[PDB]
């Protein structure tokens, strides 16, 4: 029900609402190391 393509049409919304977190890695923050990503396709791991 939420798609990155249609969200891209809105200028304000971001994929990852957590500040400093990688878009690919919106999870509950413990350490926030962007170097460990674990995802390669936003459409499969969006928000």
């Amino acid at each position: 029900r939420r798609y990155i393509g249609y969200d891209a049409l809105k200028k304000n919304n971001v994929p990852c609402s957590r500040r400093g977190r990688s878009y690919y890695d919106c999870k509950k923050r413990r350490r926030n190391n962007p170097y460990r990503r674990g995802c390669s396709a936003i459409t499969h791991c969006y928000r």
Partner: protein, 342 residues
């Protein structure tokens, strides 16, 4: 000065950030207020992480200033942030051109420069970025044509909508393994490049709406079996919908509105079980879609020359020079390489 630094990387980062603090002219949400002292990691919007080259040395891994209404430009000194992996700059007021010095950001993975005041030609600097997989340049004022090398590069997502781009989509679009591609709200002339058929294994969402696209919809879109969103609205596309649309089994959002499509709605649209929202409105269709599975699936069939439905296009406005079927080869693009279904 008298400031001691933990490692040489944060010292250059302090050089880069204070230089870029001088480049910032307006900070509504007082982000640069914290940019004092030698503890670079405490700066608002600056995010440190253990370096992969040496985990003991902490380095500046990310910069995230999303939704800050900050105004300024990107100075040359930002290229010293070689350890950067993410760079978030949505909803800022940074103007000018992307600096050539980003070539040193070898580890940069995702780049979001959306909703800004960047101008000039398309920044070819992002093409040199080795680790880049996420490129976001939406809502800016980048000029010129989209370079063909962009679609040769291995990227995950490319967003270029509502920018000052021109001169059509590069014909090598099919070479990009992108899962999400949005090139909408642009004055791009030409047809849908037929290279989309090559994108079947990787593409998941594509939106080409509100572009200046004229021509026929290529039938090799059926190879796009794992694409969820397919939006071609607000274009000058003429022709029939190919029966191959039913092969896009994962299609959830299908928007074909605001075009010049002739003929009937094929019966293969019946095969789409994941389809939840379908829109084929303000088109010159003469045949309606069947009853197959249409509650909880919204369909809008407005402004269509079908005799059965209600709220249809005017009789005058129908049987018009666009309502007439088109040769589909009278256009100068080569979308398709095999004759149409008929």
């Amino acid at each position: 000065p008298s400031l001691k630094f933990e490692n040489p990387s944060l010292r250059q980062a302090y050089i880069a950030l204070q230089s870029w603090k001088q480049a910032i002219f307006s900070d509504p949400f007082n982000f640069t207020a914290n940019w004092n002292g030698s503890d670079v990691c405490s700066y608002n919007g600056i995010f440190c992480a253990p370096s992969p080259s040496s985990p003991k040395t902490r380095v500046v891994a990310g910069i995230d200033l999303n939704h800050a209404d900050m105004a300024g430009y990107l100075p040359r000194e930002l290229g010293l942030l070689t350890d950067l992996a993410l760079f978030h700059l949505n909803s800022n007021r940074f103007c000018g051109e992307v600096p050539l010095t980003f070539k040193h950001m070898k580890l940069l993975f995702e780049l979001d420069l959306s909703n800004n005041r960047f101008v000039g030609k398309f920044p070819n600097v992002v093409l040199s970025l080795p680790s880049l997989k996420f490129l976001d340049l939406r809502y800016n004022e980048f000029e010129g044509s989209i370079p063909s090398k962009l679609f040769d590069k291995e990227l995950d997502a490319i967003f270029l909508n509502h920018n000052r781009f021109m001169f059509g989509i590069p014909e090598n679009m099919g070479n990009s393994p992108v899962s999400a591609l949005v090139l909408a709200d642009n004055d791009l002339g030409g047809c849908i490049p037929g290279s989309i058929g090559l994108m079947g294994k990787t593409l998941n969402e594509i939106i080409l709406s509100n572009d200046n696209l004229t021509g026929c919809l290529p039938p090799q879109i059926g190879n796009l079996k794992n694409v969820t969103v397919f939006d071609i609205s607000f274009n000058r596309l003429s022709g029939p919908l190919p029966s191959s649309i039913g092969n896009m089994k994962s299609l959830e959002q299908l928007n074909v509105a605001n075009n010049r499509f002739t003929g009937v709605i094929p019966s293969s649209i019946c095969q789409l079980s994941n389809l939840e929202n379908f829109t084929y409105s303000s088109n010159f269709f003469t045949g309606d879609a069947p009853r197959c599975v249409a509650d909880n699936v919204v369909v809008n069939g407005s402004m269509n020359c079908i005799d059965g439905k209600e709220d249809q296009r005017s009789s005058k406005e129908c049987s018009s020079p666009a309502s007439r079927s088109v040769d589909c080869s009278k256009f100068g693009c080569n979308n398709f390489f095999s004759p149409l279904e008929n």
